[PDB]
């Protein structure tokens, strides 16, 4: 339930993940004097992400990955902008995601392995391990998947709203377009610009 | 208090002293703090030219040795961006290669590279023992991961 | 001694093995409360490995190796079933 809750601006410092399987979340670690539980908050007016309380992470402070900073190129001491976000209100009627396409990447080039990855089962853990959360193109993950490392990067993504049996919409490369993830998008996923996944 | 002094020259002198010392001594994030000074007071002085490469290396070997390669690769986009005589130096490209062999976790390429940037610039007593420590880390998690 | 020991079928979370010399056993390491010691287990219905008590792994969880789940097919945090097993019968 996002209808109140505070939506003051915080300045935030970047520092490193506070272990692994925060990562692995790859949401924003925030501690509960911060904001609340489970809710979305945007950094800098462009970057979205699913807060959840750590006790580890002093108030005052945001916990970020390796492939966020990747993704806005930041700096370990840098300071962020850090305010609510409401994705309904912003969209309007293209809430949800109806096809959206992920390029697939060995995050260690000698890790490549020769196995058969079932896209049907990469969907079902990318759902089963991200529900309702907000996602943009060119937004960068790490994935596990059966001890295997993988960046995935969210090439381009299109929105569309309940109720359209068609997905007339354009799909839409710019980083503008957001929606939430649904036990129905149309994953497709690509090789990686180093082309190893097979 | 050479620093206190404006006496840059000395204050230079015993912070490469004092930031080797750490860095031998696995003190590694305190002597690229120090590496950071040496780098900062060194800008834009021509007769520091040739030590600001040597900075810029030590630094980011430090970084390797500490694990955060991340901080070794901002190093290396700082001191190309910074100063052109490092950015077309040999040592920005052997700290590039050494980031870019502990990201794959190849100590067997990063021992090549070290060979071939001993081969052309010899790796002093100090580079050898740091570079000897980051080898030990990338080998040791190949060894977790297995 | 297999004669008595509790068949009932538990679902355990795979793991990385806490560290090189649990995995060098290649038996299941498994906390007290989870099943008793020095017993053939069989996972899935084919995977057969040979119990150890282990403090550092919780009820309700067991460890495995790089190997096995190569042999397997396994993730980290994958559900499996464990239950006795009792190869002379």
Same mark, same amino acid.
């Given at each position: 339930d996002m209808t109140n809750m505070d939506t003051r601006t915080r300045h935030l410092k970047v520092s490193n993940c506070p272990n692994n399987s925060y990562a692995l979340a790859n949401v924003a670690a925030v501690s509960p004097n911060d904001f609340p539980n489970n809710i979305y908050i945007i950094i800098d007016n462009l970057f979205v992400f699913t807060t959840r309380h750590s006790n580890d992470i002093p108030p005052g402070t945001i916990g970020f990955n390796g492939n966020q900073r990747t993704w806005g190129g930041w700096s370990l001491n840098q300071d962020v902008q850090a305010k609510a976000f409401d994705l309904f209100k912003y969209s309007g009627k293209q809430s949800y995601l109806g096809s959206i396409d992920i390029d697939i990447s060995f995050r260690a080039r000698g890790k490549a392995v020769s196995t058969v990855f079932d896209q049907d089962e990469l969907a079902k853990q990318f759902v089963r391990c991200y529900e309702s959360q907000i996602f943009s193109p060119t937004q960068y993950l790490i994935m596990e998947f059966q001890g295997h490392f993988f960046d995935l990067k969210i090439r381009n993504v299109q929105a569309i709203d309940l109720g359209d049996i068609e997905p007339t919409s354009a799909v839409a490369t710019g980083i503008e377009t957001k929606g939430i993830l649904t036990k129905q998008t149309q994953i497709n996923f690509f090789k990686g610009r180093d082309g190893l996944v097979n | 208090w050479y620093a206190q002094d404006q006496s840059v020259a000395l204050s230079n002198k015993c912070f490469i002293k004092c930031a080797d010392l750490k860095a031998l001594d696995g003190?590694?994030?305190?002597?690229?703090d120090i590496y950071s000074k040496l780098i900062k007071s060194s800008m834009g002085n021509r007769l520091s030219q040739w030590s600001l490469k040597d900075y810029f290396l030590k630094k980011g070997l430090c970084q390797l040795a500490a694990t955060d390669a991340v901080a070794a690769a901002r190093t290396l986009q700082e001191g190309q961006s910074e100063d052109p005589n490092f950015a077309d130096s040999r040592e920005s490209n052997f700290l590039k290669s050494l980031i870019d062999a502990v990201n794959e976790g190849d100590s067997e390429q990063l021992s090549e590279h070290c060979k071939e940037f001993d081969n052309f610039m010899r790796l002093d007593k100090w580079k050898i023992t740091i570079?000897?420590?980051?080898? !030990?880390?990338?080998?040791?998690? !190949?060894?977790d991961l297995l």
């Amino acid at each position: 339930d996002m209808t109140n809750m505070d939506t003051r601006t915080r300045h935030l410092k970047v520092s490193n993940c506070p272990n692994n399987s925060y990562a692995l979340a790859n949401v924003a670690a925030v501690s509960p004097n911060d904001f609340p539980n489970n809710i979305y908050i945007i950094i800098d007016n462009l970057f979205v992400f699913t807060t959840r309380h750590s006790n580890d992470i002093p108030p005052g402070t945001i916990g970020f990955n390796g492939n966020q900073r990747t993704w806005g190129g930041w700096s370990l001491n840098q300071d962020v902008q850090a305010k609510a976000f409401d994705l309904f209100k912003y969209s309007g009627k293209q809430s949800y995601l109806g096809s959206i396409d992920i390029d697939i990447s060995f995050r260690a080039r000698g890790k490549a392995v020769s196995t058969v990855f079932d896209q049907d089962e990469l969907a079902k853990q990318f759902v089963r391990c991200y529900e309702s959360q907000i996602f943009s193109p060119t937004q960068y993950l790490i994935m596990e998947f059966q001890g295997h490392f993988f960046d995935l990067k969210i090439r381009n993504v299109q929105a569309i709203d309940l109720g359209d049996i068609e997905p007339t919409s354009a799909v839409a490369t710019g980083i503008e377009t957001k929606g939430i993830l649904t036990k129905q998008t149309q994953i497709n996923f690509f090789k990686g610009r180093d082309g190893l996944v097979n | 208090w050479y620093a206190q002094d404006q006496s840059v020259a000395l204050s230079n002198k015993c912070f490469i002293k004092c930031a080797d010392l750490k860095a031998l001594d696995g003190q590694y994030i305190e002597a690229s703090d120090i590496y950071s000074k040496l780098i900062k007071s060194s800008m834009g002085n021509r007769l520091s030219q040739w030590s600001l490469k040597d900075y810029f290396l030590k630094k980011g070997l430090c970084q390797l040795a500490a694990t955060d390669a991340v901080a070794a690769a901002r190093t290396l986009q700082e001191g190309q961006s910074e100063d052109p005589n490092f950015a077309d130096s040999r040592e920005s490209n052997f700290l590039k290669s050494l980031i870019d062999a502990v990201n794959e976790g190849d100590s067997e390429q990063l021992s090549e590279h070290c060979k071939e940037f001993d081969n052309f610039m010899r790796l002093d007593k100090w580079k050898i023992t740091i570079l000897n420590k980051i080898k !030990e880390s990338i080998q040791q998690q !190949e060894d977790d991961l297995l």
